[PDB]
Design a protein around this ligand. Structure first.
Ligand SMILES: Cc1cc(C)cc(Nc2ncc3c(n2)CN([C@@H]2CCN(C(=O)c4cc5nn[nH]c5cc4F)[C@@H](C)C2)C3)c1
Ligand SMILES: CC(C)CCC[C@@H](C)[C@H]1CC[C@H]2[C@@H]3[C@H](O)C=C4C[C@@H](O)CC[C@]4(C)[C@H]3CC[C@]12C
Ligand SMILES: *[C@@H]1O[C@H](CO)[C@@H](O)[C@H](O)[C@H]1NC(C)=O
Ligand SMILES: [Ca+2]
Ligand code: NA
Ligand code: NA
Ligand SMILES: [Zn+2]
Ligand SMILES: [Zn+2]
Length: 791
């Protein structure tokens, strides 16, 4: 019942026995003498020349005695002050070609140095403020920034780091949550947050444990001084082979604390950053003392950034809603609304959304049903995420009532593509590359890398395994392209016009002349630059060849899965000729029975149609007739045709003109259960009236060009440049508050908000892109995880 030679033990003492571990303070279950024995502060955390070869005084926080190395409780600067050795930071970068570990080390250890609220742009303050962190950054592998997950909050991002899952999957969807199944709230006070029922996925410490790799406790009670956390990690590294963990985590509440008080641009931010660097200095001096400075892989990583947010910049729901007493709000840098009571009949989600939609000119939040949020946020598929969500503008709060100098000048939680929310990544050690810069990447990718660093098999996660192989000197995972599951058909012109009764009309009116205009020819070479997309699910689809485009037409969904076409820089935009306005032509390659019918579209009062290949970019008047084929048409709300018509008529030409040509792949997405995955036939909930033509929830486009823009898109030798979108197929433009104005004022704004990774589309379509390129597969995986942020 005491903490004698037990302080910060890795042992798990069950209740009611008093504990001496990292978390005993947080549980409030420590032994009476924990505070005196384990929270020693006597003489601080640094050796001085006077202390060198001192008699061991056990009341001292750390020791400068001759026995301290064998005991493994020397102050981190003992060798420097007493044995005339240099600080790690004062040493030149020396490449770590192989891990230099003591015999008995079966793998290089990993230390995750996690810093709360560390904005990417803090790194610009340089070696003046942070010499130790700047040496790690410059000697090791670093990204300009790392993208957090939404919401850009502490627990959701820390747990994403540990699991490689989106919050919707791992279950920590906020710092605050209500679970209707549990009928309980997740809060930070007391024992609730320790209940395992909240925590999904498989965190790194459990992955390690389950594969026979010992993990040190990632969590630290705030009571434990940072200096003690570093010494405790270093103590654990000195344990014998059978006890010594391979994976460790350090956590700092800084620079988050000061960020909230002073804001991210305050000169007061310098002192927190100096102290963080000092703590990093103690770790690296500590590792060098143990001769583990060329053995251990160190990850310096933040959970999220920090924005300027004052209490003056608060939207109040009481200015929109006639009854705010009938709702519960999760307030601040995001809004989540649910009904307060059940007896209450006044609450109605549709009325609330209407009341919160474009009511004030400068409105600093936007209401969404969670299924209508940008798909890149992946924030819908969890019963803990309220149906009604408010996306708050950066620098702003949303609160229920006015009554709810400011105390705070900094906050986070905003859209994860916001610059101020971006955080840091640095990898240093034998397994990371030497003096290497890598492109920015998403925090969901780190779990796979940390598994690779530790020789662990990752649990299933939202990382793209291989996409970060370019961070590592050595890779124990080689990615393999997935096997195509469905082989395409190549149907010839076979059906007579008399066989078609689709109720479609066109102003049309040499059989083998029709055929040669719809043969392979050079179509694939011109319009499919990166090879045919692979269909990774069981289905029946047809490859259709045209002068201007190639399509994979689904005989199940009665529309293309993808439409591929190349627009040269020099391409000319034409109109839809008046005589072809309402033209839809039967496709004599495809059975009447596996075609859409124009009768469906007339009976559906709310539903019109568009085309995947745009008639506007036809190579000739002749070729334009191919664009009006029933196999090129898709269901579109008149409201959405405004967006799509502008994209096709104006923006594709624009992108082609800016990027020295563009390859475009467009098609439908079905995600009615908003799980971010391709719907099966059963899961599709809307069809065109009196038909089996399924209505897409979204329309995607993948726009590819040469990264070397001095080479045209169709003659690119090296890396590719991609931007993609997943546009919500909405029957209104309520999302766009300026949609009253010309399309030039709002459509591109809407598209930028729904920017997507190629991976996002692959999940939502069951397609695999970029299968025929001159690029390594690991390079292609990085390309597929890229997001164009427009920030
Ligand atoms: C690498 C890694 C992963 C994981 C999952 C774990 C750790 N370690 C760790 N150790 C101690 C803590 C944490 N992680 C996270 N903890 C916080 C304490 C309580 N808390 C807050 O009041 C809090 C609320 C905020 N709202 N806006 N900003 C906030 C900052 C805060 F600290 C939680 C959010 C989490 C302590 C380390
Ligand atoms: C200072 C406070 C923030 C400390 C809070 C720590 C608390 C959230 C931690 C403590 C123990 C953690 C669980 C434990 O490691 C085991 C597992 C198994 C794993 O498969 C799922 C996660 C879970 C339940 C951990 C969740 C986080 C816990 C409760
Ligand atoms: C994220 O990963 C989990 C586990 O593999 C999976 O259940 C989920 O479908 C993934 N989400 C997306 C959008 O890929
Ligand atoms: Ca789905
Ligand atoms: Na109609
Ligand atoms: Na509008
Ligand atoms: Zn935080
Ligand atoms: Zn914070």
């Amino acid at each position: 019942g005491s903490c004698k030679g037990r302080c910060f033990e890795l042992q798990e003492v069950g209740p009611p026995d008093c504990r001496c571990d990292n978390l005993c303070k947080s549980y409030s279950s420590c032994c009476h003498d924990f505070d005196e024995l384990c929270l020693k502060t006597a003489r601080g955390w640094e050796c001085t020349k006077d202390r060198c070869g001192e008699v061991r005084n056990e009341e001292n926080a750390c020791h400068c005695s001759e026995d301290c190395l064998s005991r493994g409780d020397c102050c981190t600067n003992y060798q420097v002050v007493c044995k005339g050795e240099s600080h790690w930071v004062d040493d030149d970068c020396e490449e770590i070609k192989v891990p230099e570990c003591p015999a008995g080390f079966v793998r290089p250890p990993l230390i995750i140095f996690s810093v709360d609220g560390f904005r990417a742009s803090y790194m610009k303050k340089g070696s003046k403020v942070m010499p130790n962190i700047e040496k790690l950054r410059s000697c090791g592998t670093h990204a300009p920034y790392m993208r957090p997950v939404y919401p850009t909050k502490t627990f959701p991002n820390l747990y994403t780091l540990a699991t490689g899952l989106y919050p919707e999957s791992h279950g920590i969807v906020g710092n605050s949550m209500y679970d209707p199944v549990f009928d309980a709230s997740f809060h930070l006070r007391g024992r609730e947050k320790f209940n395992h029922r909240w925590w999904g996925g498989q965190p790194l410490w459990i992955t390690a444990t389950k594969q026979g790799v010992r993990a040190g406790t990632f969590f630290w009670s705030v009571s434990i001084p940072h200096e003690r956390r570093i010494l405790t990690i270093l103590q654990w590294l000195s344990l014998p082979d059978n006890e010594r963990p391979s994976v460790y985590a350090f956590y700092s509440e800084q620079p988050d604390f000061s960020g909230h008080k002073y804001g991210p641009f305050g000169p007061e931010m310098t002192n927190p950053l100096r102290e963080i660097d000092k703590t990093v200095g103690q770790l690296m001096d500590g590792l060098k003392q143990l001769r583990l400075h060329r053995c251990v892989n160190v990850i310096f990583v933040g959970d999220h950034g920090m924005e300027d947010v004052t209490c003056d910049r608060t939207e109040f729901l009481s200015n929109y809603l006639t009854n705010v007493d009938d709702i519960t709000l999760v307030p601040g840098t995001l809004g989540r609304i649910r009904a307060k009571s059940i007896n209450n009949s006044k609450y109605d989600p549709k009325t609330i959304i209407a009341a919160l939609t474009c009511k004030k000119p400068d409105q600093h939040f936007k209401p969404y049903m969670k299924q209508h949020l940008p798909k890149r946020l992946h924030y819908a598929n969890n019963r803990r995420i309220e149906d009604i969500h408010l996306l708050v503008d950066r620098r702003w709060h949303v609160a229920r009532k006015p009554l709810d100098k400011c105390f705070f000048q900094g906050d986070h939680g905003f859209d994860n593509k916001v610059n101020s929310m971006q955080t840091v990544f640095v990898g240093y050690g034998p397994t990371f590359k030497y003096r290497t810069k890598v492109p920015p990447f998403e925090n969901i990718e780190l779990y796979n890398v940390m598994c690779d660093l530790l020789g662990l098999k990752p649990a299933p996660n939202n990382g793209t395994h291989g996409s970060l192989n370019h961070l590592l000197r050595t890779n124990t995972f080689r990615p393999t392209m997935p096997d195509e599951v469905s082989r395409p058909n190549y149907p010839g012109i076979m059906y007579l016009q008399s066989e078609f009764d689709l109720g479609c009309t066109c102003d049309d009116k040499l059989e083998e002349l029709n055929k040669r205009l719809h043969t392979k020819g050079s179509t694939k070479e011109r319009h499919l630059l990166y090879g045919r997309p692979a269909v990774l699910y069981r289905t029946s689809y047809d490859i259709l060849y045209h002068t201007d485009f190639e399509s994979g037409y689904s005989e199940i969904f009665l529309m293309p899965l993808w439409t591929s076409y190349t627009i040269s820089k020099q391409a000319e935009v034409s109109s839809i000729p008046e005589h072809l306005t309402n033209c839809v032509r039967p496709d004599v390659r495809v059975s009447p029975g596996f075609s859409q019918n124009c009768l469906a579209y007339k009976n559906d009062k709310q539903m019109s149609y568009g085309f995947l290949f745009p008639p506007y970019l036809s190579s000739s008047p002749e070729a334009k007739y191919d664009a009006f084929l029933v196999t090129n048409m898709v269901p579109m709300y008149p409201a959405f045709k405004r967006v799509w018509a502008y994209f096709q008529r104006v923006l594709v030409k624009k992108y082609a003109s800016e990027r020295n040509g563009v390859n475009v792949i467009s098609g439908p997405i079905f995600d009615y259960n908003y799980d971010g995955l391709r719907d099966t036939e059963d899961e599709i909930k809307q069809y065109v009236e009196g038909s089996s033509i399924p209505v897409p929830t979204h329309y995607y486009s993948i726009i590819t060009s040469c990264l070397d823009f001095t080479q045209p898109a169709d003659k690119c030798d090296g890396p590719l440049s991609v931007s993609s979108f997943i546009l919500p197929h909405r029957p209104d433009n309520d999302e766009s508050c300026a949609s009253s104005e010309d399309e030039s004022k709002w459509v591109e704004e809407l598209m930028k908000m729904h920017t997507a990774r190629v991976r996002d589309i692959e999940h939502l379509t069951g397609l695999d892109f970029y299968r025929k390129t001159s690029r390594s597969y690991s390079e292609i995986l990085t390309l597929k995880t890229y997001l164009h942020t427009y920030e």
